[PDB]
Design a protein around this ligand. Structure first.
Ligand code: MET
Ligand SMILES: [Cl-]
Ligand SMILES: [Zn+2]
Ligand SMILES: [Zn+2]
Ligand SMILES: [Zn+2]
Ligand SMILES: [Zn+2]
Ligand SMILES: [Zn+2]
Ligand SMILES: [Zn+2]
Ligand SMILES: [Zn+2]
Ligand SMILES: [Zn+2]
Ligand SMILES: [Zn+2]
Ligand SMILES: [Zn+2]
Ligand SMILES: [Zn+2]
Length: 260
């Protein structure tokens, strides 16, 4: 059933995220510590997948969300006829291709070793699906019949030398699929929960137009007339500190790269 989540409660500012494992949420404890003197309590709704946080925000269940990149936001707004806005950039985490697993060993240590007739899992939402497909193309596994800013779908695969089966799954399910596929494209959000080591990935998305993959803090367009606007501006100030910069780098082991 849709919208699985839990809450993590410390003026009160409610933030929707997607749950991450290990130390990756420590940025939020540091931000809370910074805005404490200002009288601000943060409360988090932590969803399990990318379909829910923007809806929570447009519906007024939360004040902010922090989970997506600009492309995901733009696409979600267009699809849903909404106009949530980015009010700060956070980090970039270039998406990676990971080997399928045999127990806890990687089956492959190079792209070239993916077998003919193999299966690769990719996210199934338009922007991360596209992102994964361009990744598979830059890794030399496929060619696409779209380019530039065109969203690629699986129907846009033009060449497929190894006859790979490309299976699109929920973004939150690609890392879990690694026990039974040859390779998967996995968003940073899901890496730690599956116990993956991002530094042992087969392939990393190439920098270039990289800003479209920048993560953001998002609110409703009229947030600035809200009684919570002052508190929101302080939270943003706390995120954009040297202290938080360091916590993100340390608590994610470098997986998330701050962009401010
Ligand atoms: C919901 S869009 C995906 C965001 C994810 N943190 C990424 O940068 O890959
Ligand atoms: Cl805390
Ligand atoms: Zn709830
Ligand atoms: Zn709550
Ligand atoms: Zn929790
Ligand atoms: Zn959590
Ligand atoms: Zn915490
Ligand atoms: Zn906390
Ligand atoms: Zn409610
Ligand atoms: Zn409600
Ligand atoms: Zn899809
Ligand atoms: Zn598709
Ligand atoms: Zn490592």
């Amino acid at each position: 059933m849709r919208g699985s989540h839990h809450h993590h409660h410390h003026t009160t500012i409610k933030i929707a995220t997607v749950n991450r494992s290990g130390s990756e949420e420590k940025r939020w404890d540091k931000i809370q510590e910074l805005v404490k003197k200002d009288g601000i309590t943060l409360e988090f709704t932590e969803f399990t997948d990318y379909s829910q946080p923007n809806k929570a925000t447009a519906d007024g269940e939360v004040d902010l969300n922090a989970f997506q990149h600009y492309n995901f936001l733009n696409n979600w707004n267009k699809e849903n006829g909404k106009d949530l806005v980015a009010i700060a950039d956070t980090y970039i985490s270039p998406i990676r291709l990971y080997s399928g697993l045999n127990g806890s060993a990687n089956k492959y240590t190079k792209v070239e070793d993916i077998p003919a007739n193999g299966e690769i899992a990719v996210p199934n939402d338009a922007t991360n699906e596209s992102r994964a497909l361009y990744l598979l193309q830059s890794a030399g596994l496929i060619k696409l019949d779209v380019s530039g800013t065109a969203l690629a779908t699986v129907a846009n695969i033009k060449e497929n030398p190894k006859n790979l089966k490309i299976t699109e799954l929920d973004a939150s399910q690609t890392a879990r699929s690694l026990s039974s596929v040859d390779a998967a494209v996995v968003n940073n959000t899901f890496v730690t929960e599956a116990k993956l080591d991002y530094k042992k990935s087969l392939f990393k998305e190439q920098a270039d137009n990289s800003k479209q993959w920048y993560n953001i803090i998002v609110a409703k367009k009229d947030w600035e007339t809200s009684p919570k606007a002052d508190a929101i501006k302080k939270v943003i100030a706390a995120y954009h500190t040297d202290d938080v910069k360091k916590v993100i780098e340390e608590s994610s082991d470098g997986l998330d790269q701050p962009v401010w």
